[PDB]
């Protein structure tokens, strides 16, 4: 619906402040400190960059010199966290999307994967790798990094799929969309603060199961929107707007929310969440908005242990009693 | 969009909108009293000739068209060329009794309060209407901003009378023409009454909140969408300790329309609005409006003044 919830930063001129904006120095320091705790070490990005290079090269080759090999690769793109630069420590995994020329069958997905790892092993017999297939392609990982290869095909072949011979249409369409996201991201969300926020939102959603329904794609669009959609970018700590727009029902029924830039014609990204999940996301952010006001940002950021209780339990902030927002959705 | 939510806010509106009998009584009392002050003034200008009272103005509910079922409190402002005093209050209150007699045979009790710097007028109807006449003067604002009798009226009381008079002019210019604004304010005025959590917002802060929130939208809204936008606004944490707060447009110095709310009120009002929002979003707005689920110019309540 042509309904746009309230956003203070969309019409700030109409709400002049009375007293200078309080000093949120500690908040900015903690936000950066946390980004640093979540950021991958120097040992980690070496191992990943190394494995991503090795595999990406073998695939580059297979495209120019298909050789005698019966799997025609048409294109390869780096997508997801690794490409965007929103990777978190502990999860050293990169995503590669490989578009096949012909129909992507289960036998092919295994042939390509085994052919790829066999090329790495011929180049470097000393390094130990393992290669496993799945229903979405295959994986190759070393002792400290894994590269996921997402298989799909040239659209031409989408209308010609076979429910039992080729991979699930949904899986193939997901990989393609992945390419459009990364394209849009490198192109639009490639900002220092956007990338830092998306990493913090990914962390928030993990310590607060209320935010679970939120997908990586929504988080991307949410971070970028909170930072950029307003002249200049917003300061990282002005994070507060992410919670505030969720609280004012950006992803509630009747709201435009955010339209998918990688789809047609006017898709509401939050339409992939059920009504119950929408309610949950909203009331979760509603509590966290209140909790941040009471200066509970060290808890919200996870610097003080577990805080998942804050969203379901009564908390007392300096004599102020905070009652968490509750379910309002009624399953008919 | 929001057809059903429009149905409910408009039906709730009907439920709280005063009756023709209430309104007719208001029109009468206001008209009588205005025309009576018109004469009380004319009478003075004669005594002097052989100015002092510069005008009579409507403020508060009457002026804003915010009268609801059960409202018995009306208000007027009396402008005085100089700084009103005790001598002028007594002189007006007294002579007002005589001039009413030239407009109607209805009997009104006239009672004055030098402390309230006003003249209260009660009629004889059950329940009775009470209209307060606030005496003041601009010469008082000038002075606060920077050789007279010994009976000047309470400056604070006189300064507040000017504030409301500025609220009344502001409302007519900004809020009135704002589509669904006056309606949403009424229906939310009734909610501040029912839910003690919203109580502190009653009046000026609610009026500002509704004009701001509704006015910041790109396009005109219906009663349903308009009310929602107010919930969202609150739900965003606008009235929380930290944050813009509602800035007062009728003050030369930066003033927060809700700077009086305390940390817990701000918390409760916000948590309430938040829940009300989601209830509305999931087709339960009748619950926020305290009603059962259902199966022109509403802004103009009583005619503008002729006398003034
Ligand atoms: O089977 C598929 C198909 C497509 N995709 C596409 O690839 C992307 C995978 O995204 P991830 O799950 O890797 O999330 P991320 O990289 O943003 O963060 P990390 O958890 O990796 O640190 C998603 O955005 C989806 O569009 C898959 O992940 N799996
Ligand atoms: Mg990844």
């Amino acid at each position: 619906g042509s309904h746009i919830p309230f956003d203070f930063y969309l019409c700030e001129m109409a709400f002049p402040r009375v007293k200078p904006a309080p000093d949120e120095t500690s908040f900015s320091e903690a936000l950066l400190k946390r980004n640093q705790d979540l950021a991958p070490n120097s040992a980690e990005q070496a191992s990943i960059l190394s494995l991503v290079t090795k595999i990406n090269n073998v695939i580059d080759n297979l495209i120019v010199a298909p050789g005698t090999f019966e799997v025609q690769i048409e294109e390869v793109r780096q997508v997801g966290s690794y490409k965007k630069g929103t990777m978190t420590t502990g999860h050293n995994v990169a995503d590669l999307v490989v578009i096949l020329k012909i129909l992507p069958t289960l036998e092919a997905v295994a042939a390509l994967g085994n052919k790829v790892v066999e090329s790495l092993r011929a180049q470097d017999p000393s390094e130990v790798l393992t290669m496993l297939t799945n229903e979405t392609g295959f994986e190759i990982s070393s002792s400290d990094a894994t590269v996921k290869i997402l298989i799909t095909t040239v659209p031409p072949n989408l209308r010609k799929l076979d429910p039992e011979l080729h991979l699930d249409i949904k899986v193939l369409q997901s990989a393609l969309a992945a390419i459009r996201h990364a394209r849009w991201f490198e192109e639009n969300a490639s900002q220092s603060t956007v990338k830092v926020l998306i990493r913090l939102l990914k962390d928030l959603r993990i310590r607060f199961p209320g935010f679970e329904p939120l997908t990586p794609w929504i988080l991307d669009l949410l971070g970028h929107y909170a930072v950029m959609n307003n002249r200049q970018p917003l300061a990282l700590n002005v994070y507060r707007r992410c919670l505030q727009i969720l609280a004012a029902g950006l992803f509630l029924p009747g709201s435009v929310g955010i339209t998918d830039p990688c789809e047609s014609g006017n898709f509401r990204v939050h339409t992939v969440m059920t009504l119950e999940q929408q309610d949950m996301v909203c009331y979760t952010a509603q509590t966290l908005v209140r909790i941040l006001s009471h200066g509970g940002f060290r808890k919200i950021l996870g610097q003080e242990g577990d805080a998942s209780y804050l969203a379901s339990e009564i908390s007392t902030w300096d004599g102020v009693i905070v009652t968490p927002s509750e379910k309002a959705y009624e399953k008919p | 969009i929001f057809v059903n939510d429009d149905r409910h806010v408009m039906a709730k509106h009907s439920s709280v909108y005063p009756t023709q009998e209430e309104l007719e009584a208001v029109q009468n009392m206001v008209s009588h009293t205005e025309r009576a002050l018109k004469a009380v003034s004319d009478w003075i200008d004669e005594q002097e000739k052989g100015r002092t009272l510069r005008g009579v103005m409507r403020v508060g509910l009457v002026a804003k068209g915010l009268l609801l079922k059960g409202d018995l409190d009306l208000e007027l402002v009396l402008l005085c060329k100089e700084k009103p005093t005790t001598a002028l209050l007594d002189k007006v209150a007294d002579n007002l009794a005589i001039q009413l007699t030239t407009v109607t045979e209805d009997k009104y009790e006239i009672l004055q309060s030098v402390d309230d710097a006003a003249i209260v007028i009660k009629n004889t109807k059950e329940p009775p209407l009470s209209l307060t006449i606030h005496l003041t003067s601009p010469v008082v604002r000038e002075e606060m901003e920077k050789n007279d009798p010994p009976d000047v009226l309470d400056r604070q009381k006189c300064l507040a009378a000017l504030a409301s008079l500025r609220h009344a002019k502001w409302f007519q210019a900004r809020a009135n023409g704002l589509k669904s604004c006056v309606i949403v304010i009424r229906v939310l005025r009734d909610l501040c009454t029912r839910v003690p959590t919203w109580g502190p917002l009653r009046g000026w802060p609610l009026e500002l909140l509704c004009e701001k929130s509704i006015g910041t939208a790109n396009r005109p809204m219906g009663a349903g969408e308009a009310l929602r936008r107010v919930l969202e606004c609150l739900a965003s944490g606008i009235v929380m300790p930290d944050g813009s707060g509602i800035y007062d447009p009728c003050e030369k110095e930066a003033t927060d329309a809700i700077g009086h709310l305390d940390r817990q009120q701000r918390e409760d009002i916000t948590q309430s609005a938040q829940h009300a929002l989601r209830l509305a979003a999931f087709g339960q707005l009748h619950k926020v409006l305290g009603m059962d689920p259902l199966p022109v110019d509403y802004t103009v309540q009583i005619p503008p003044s002729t006398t003034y």
Side-chain angles (χ1 to χ4, degrees), chain A residues 1 3-12 14-16 18 20-22 24-32 34-35 37-69 71 73-76 78-100 104-106 108-113 115-117 119-134 136-147 149-158 161-163 166-169 171-190 193-201 203-230 233-299 301-326 328-330 332, chain B residues 2 4-43 46-48 50 52-53 55-71 73-80 84-90 93-106 108-110 112-113 115-121 123-124 127-138 140-141 143 145 148-151 153-154 157-168 170-171 173-201 203-218 220-245 247-251 253-268 270-295 298-308:
Chain A
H3 176 63
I4 279 134
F6 182 83
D7 201 340
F8 169 90
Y9 306 85
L10 265 205
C11 64
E12 256 178 293
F15 283 96
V18 169
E24 284 168 32
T25 290
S26 294
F27 187 24
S28 279
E29 277 172 4
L31 272 163
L32 277 207
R34 192 74 171 112
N35 173 62
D37 295 337
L38 293 172
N41 48 68
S42 292
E44 261 183 318
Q45 4 157 123
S47 19
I48 195 46
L49 151 70
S50 164
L51 195 56
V52 166
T53 278
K54 288 168 167 191
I55 289 92
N56 192 31
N57 285 355
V58 174
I59 309 182
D60 278 330
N61 286 2
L62 271 182
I63 295 186
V64 306
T68 252
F69 192 58
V71 179
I73 321 187
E74 141 110 349
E75 191 172 345
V76 63
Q78 289 163 10
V79 296
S81 166
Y82 171 90
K83 180 60 172 172
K84 312 166 156 85
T86 45
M87 282 188 93
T88 297
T89 195
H91 198 246
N92 209 28
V93 179
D95 300 284
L96 265 188
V97 180
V98 199
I99 307 171
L100 307 184
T105 68
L106 268 179
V109 178
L112 179 56
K115 182 54 164 61
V116 169
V117 71
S119 296
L120 299 175
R121 292 182 168 129
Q123 282 153 28
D124 202 354
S126 37
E127 176 178 45
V128 195
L129 326 138
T130 97
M131 192 281 303
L132 290 168
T133 71
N134 48 86
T136 61
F138 65 92
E139 282 177 1
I140 290 166
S141 56
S142 46
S143 51
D144 39 14
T146 301
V147 178
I149 289 85
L150 316 180
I151 297 294
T152 202
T153 194
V154 291
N157 290 63
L158 292 190
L161 268 151
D162 170 70
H166 319 124
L167 303 209
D168 202 39
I169 175 127
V171 163
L172 304 174
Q173 300 248 47
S174 296
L176 296 170
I179 287 183
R180 309 201 292 271
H181 301 359
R183 177 160 74 234
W184 174 93
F185 193 110
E186 96 164 302
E187 228 125 78
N188 301 265
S190 30
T193 305
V194 167
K195 314 164 107 177
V196 172
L197 181 65
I198 283 133
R199 174 186 290 119
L200 293 177
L201 290 164
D203 190 49
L204 194 65
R205 167 192 175 278
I206 284 308
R207 295 178 288 83
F208 282 102
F211 286 142
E212 192 276 334
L214 292 170
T215 68
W217 182 227
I218 283 182
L219 290 189
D220 285 339
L221 297 168
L222 188 77
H224 165 267
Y225 170 101
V227 175
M228 294 296 335
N229 178 333
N230 60 46
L234 297 190
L236 182 68
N237 77 298
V238 179
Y239 197 93
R240 170 178 307 262
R241 174 192 193 177
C242 263
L243 299 170
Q244 277 177 7
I245 56 189
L246 284 190
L250 177 67
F251 295 139
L252 284 189
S255 159
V256 283
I258 300 177
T259 291
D260 195 333
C262 309
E263 311 277 349
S264 57
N266 266 15
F267 188 68
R268 300 190 291 164
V269 301
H270 79 83
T271 297
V272 302
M273 279 183 326
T274 67
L275 285 188
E276 185 206 69
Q277 287 171 333
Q278 296 183 6
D279 179 39
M280 175 166 45
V281 171
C282 190
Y283 74 63
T284 311
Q286 308 214 296
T287 299
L288 290 183
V289 147
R290 271 187 285 108
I291 291 260
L292 197 70
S293 283
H294 293 156
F297 71 82
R298 247 156 228 298
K299 267 286 195 195
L301 279 168
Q303 308 193 307
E304 283 180 9
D306 212 7
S308 44
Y309 74 87
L310 259 58
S312 77
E313 269 169 48
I314 273 160
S315 354
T316 298
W317 299 94
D318 195 10
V320 189
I321 309 163
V322 176
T323 295
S325 284
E326 289 149 8
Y329 172 71
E330 271 186 340
Chain B
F2 295 11
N4 213 16
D5 277 350
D6 282 339
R7 274 182 72 217
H8 284 67
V9 173
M10 287 308 304
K12 185 66 184 189
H13 178 254
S14 290
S15 305
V16 294
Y17 189 90
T19 60
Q20 304 302 296
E21 217 62 25
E22 292 174 319
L23 287 172
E24 287 184 24
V26 182
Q27 152 64 3
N28 283 336
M29 194 171 188
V30 171
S31 173
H32 293 158
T33 314
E34 270 167 355
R35 302 174 63 191
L37 288 173
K38 172 77 200 132
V40 169
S41 179
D42 283 356
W43 184 77
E46 279 307 328
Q47 266 186 5
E48 280 162 1
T52 288
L53 296 160
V56 182
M57 332 269 192
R58 290 173 190 189
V59 305
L61 298 169
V62 144
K64 305 175 181 172
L66 298 175
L67 284 168
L68 302 174
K69 270 184 185 62
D71 287 328
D73 292 314
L74 319 171
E75 308 207 303
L76 265 182
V77 147
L78 221 193
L79 279 334
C80 317
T85 65
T86 302
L88 178 66
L89 177 67
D90 196 75
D94 277 335
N95 188 262
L96 182 70
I98 292 204
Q99 301 296 359
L100 282 148
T101 191
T102 61
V103 201
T104 196
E105 286 205 88
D106 289 16
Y108 300 100
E109 335 172 2
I110 293 173
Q112 46 176 316
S113 179
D115 313 294
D116 278 2
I119 297 179
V120 183
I121 317 231
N123 80 359
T124 76
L129 280 180
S130 211
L131 180 157
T132 294
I133 296 183
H134 298 113
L135 293 89
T136 199
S137 169
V140 198
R141 183 179 63 84
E143 290 203 12
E145 280 177 4
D148 48 29
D151 42 21
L153 299 179
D154 196 49
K157 297 301 215 168
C158 296
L159 285 175
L162 290 166
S164 46
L165 171 53
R166 273 182 271 113
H167 298 172
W170 176 89
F171 195 104
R174 302 313 292 155
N176 210 68
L178 195 41
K179 169 172 209 172
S180 303
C181 185
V182 177
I183 296 175
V184 166
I185 294 178
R186 290 193 187 134
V187 168
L188 278 204
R189 206 173 100 85
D190 166 77
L191 160 61
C192 291
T193 294
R194 303 194 279 92
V195 179
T197 280
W198 290 59
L201 297 169
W204 192 226
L206 182 57
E207 293 155 19
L208 286 170
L209 173 70
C210 294
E211 195 271 334
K212 298 240 187 60
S213 88
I214 290 175
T216 51
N218 304 121
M221 286 172 155
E225 188 178 1
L227 195 159
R228 195 184 273 200
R229 178 159 186 89
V230 187
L231 291 175
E232 294 164 344
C233 181
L234 284 170
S236 74
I238 206 90
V239 309
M240 291 290 267
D242 54 5
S244 44
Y247 186 82
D248 189 328
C250 289
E251 282 314 349
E253 316 244 319
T255 301
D256 191 12
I258 60 172
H260 63 275
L261 261 70
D262 86 34
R263 294 190 312 169
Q264 183 74 42
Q265 322 201 277
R266 303 183 174 271
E267 159 72 21
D268 299 347
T270 299
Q271 204 250 4
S272 206
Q274 281 178 340
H275 183 53
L277 180 57
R278 284 181 293 105
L279 284 172
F282 298 111
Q284 276 166 116
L285 175 75
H286 68 98
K287 294 180 181 181
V288 178
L289 301 175
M291 65 194 281
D292 274 341
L294 293 179
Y298 320 60
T299 88
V300 180
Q301 272 184 347
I302 86 159
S305 187
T306 59
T307 325
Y308 286 96

